[PDB]
Amino acid sequence: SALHWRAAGAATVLLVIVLLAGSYLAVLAERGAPGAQLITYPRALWWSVETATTVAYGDLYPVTLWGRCVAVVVMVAGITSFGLVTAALATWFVGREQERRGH
């Protein structure tokens, strides 16, 4: 199959994996910090989605060093996955336009 679509699918499954692992590790890192809110796995998964999409409502965020490192990993994974989807769309469009120009 075309490399851009395979990479898009791989990035999707990798982002799902990163969301689950980030929820687990965020709860692990935040429990023990007085005042921490990112301490139950359901809302941790919600927060991981918020973080990967950059749609950060501000209802939840890490307060510890390791929670914030987990957050950075989730941020970069989400941003690069969505950018890879954009790149795959651009490649598809470029190929289609080349063909439409008979080249």
Epitope: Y24, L28, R31, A33, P34, G35, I39, T40, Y41, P42
Partner: antibody
Framework: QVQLQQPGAELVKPGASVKLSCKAS????????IHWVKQRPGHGLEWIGE????????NYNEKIQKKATLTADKSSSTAFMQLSSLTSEDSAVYYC???????????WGAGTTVTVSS | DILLTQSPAILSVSPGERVSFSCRAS??????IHWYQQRTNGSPRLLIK???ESISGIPSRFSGSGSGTDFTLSINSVESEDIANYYC?????????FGSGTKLEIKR
């Protein structure tokens, strides 16, 4: 079947230490947390600490003096709390409870009555 | 740490009357409150989770309400088996904390 099994009682001499056990059955998930709660006779419930057996990480109530050390054995599915250098203030019922990582204590053990006396 | 105030400490009610325990948090905690019942010589028993969600095996007589800082546990038509201490517990912020408990008394 009873989900959390605790011994009925432990007698401890002042200054000595004791290891309480909590054997878990039923569904076990990587998101499980085992909590320990202290209750003195005629008093309320006091949270001591928590441990996540899948990782071994333990957290403790910082408002009280740390007398407890939490461990877990995954093969036997048993959580342990070591109370050290006990005095009469440590005499109480100690419960273990299981939380599925979503904030509430779905199940409690029967509690171990710890008496500190000579 | 979040303080859970349960006042009054003792509730006295006639049989068959509706009763309401109060739990007030020192800060807003959404709906992250859970209610437990402890009878004499017994271990705590989860009655309500997340302020209002029912628990399997708990009589429909029990309900919960509230959000933010003020929460209520209600029993419609109290009966003798309800005589117990009732505790609220929050999971919004670390560490989890307990209320000081309210005892239910029945005037027969």
């Amino acid at each position: 079947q009873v989900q959390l099994q605790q011994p009925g009682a432990e007698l401890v001499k002042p200054g000595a230490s004791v290891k309480l056990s909590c054997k878990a059955s039923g569904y076990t998930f990587t998101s499980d947390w085992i909590h320990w709660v202290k209750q003195r006779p005629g008093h309320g419930l006091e949270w001591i600490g928590e441990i996540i057996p899948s990782y071994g990480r333990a957290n403790y109530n910082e408002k009280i003096q740390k007398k407890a050390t939490l461990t877990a054995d995954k093969s036997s599915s048993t959580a342990f709390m070591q109370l050290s250098s006990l005095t009469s203030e440590d005499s109480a019922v100690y419960y273990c409870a299981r939380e599925r990582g979503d904030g509430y204590f779905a199940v409690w053990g029967a509690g171990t009555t710890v008496t500190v006396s000579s | 740490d979040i303080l859970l105030t349960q006042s009054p400490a003792i509730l006295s009610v006639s049989p068959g009357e509706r009763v309401s325990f109060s739990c007030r948090a020192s800060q807003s905690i959404g709906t992250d409150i859970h209610w437990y019942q402890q009878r004499t010589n017994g271990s705590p028993r989860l009655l309500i989770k997340y302020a209002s969600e029912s628990i399997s095996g708990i009589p429909s007589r029990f309900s919960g309400s509230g959000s933010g800082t003020d929460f209520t546990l209600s029993i419609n038509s109290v009966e003798s088996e309800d005589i117990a201490n009732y505790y609220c517990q929050q999971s919004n912020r670390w560490p989890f904390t307990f209320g000081s408990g309210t005892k239910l008394e029945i005037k027969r």
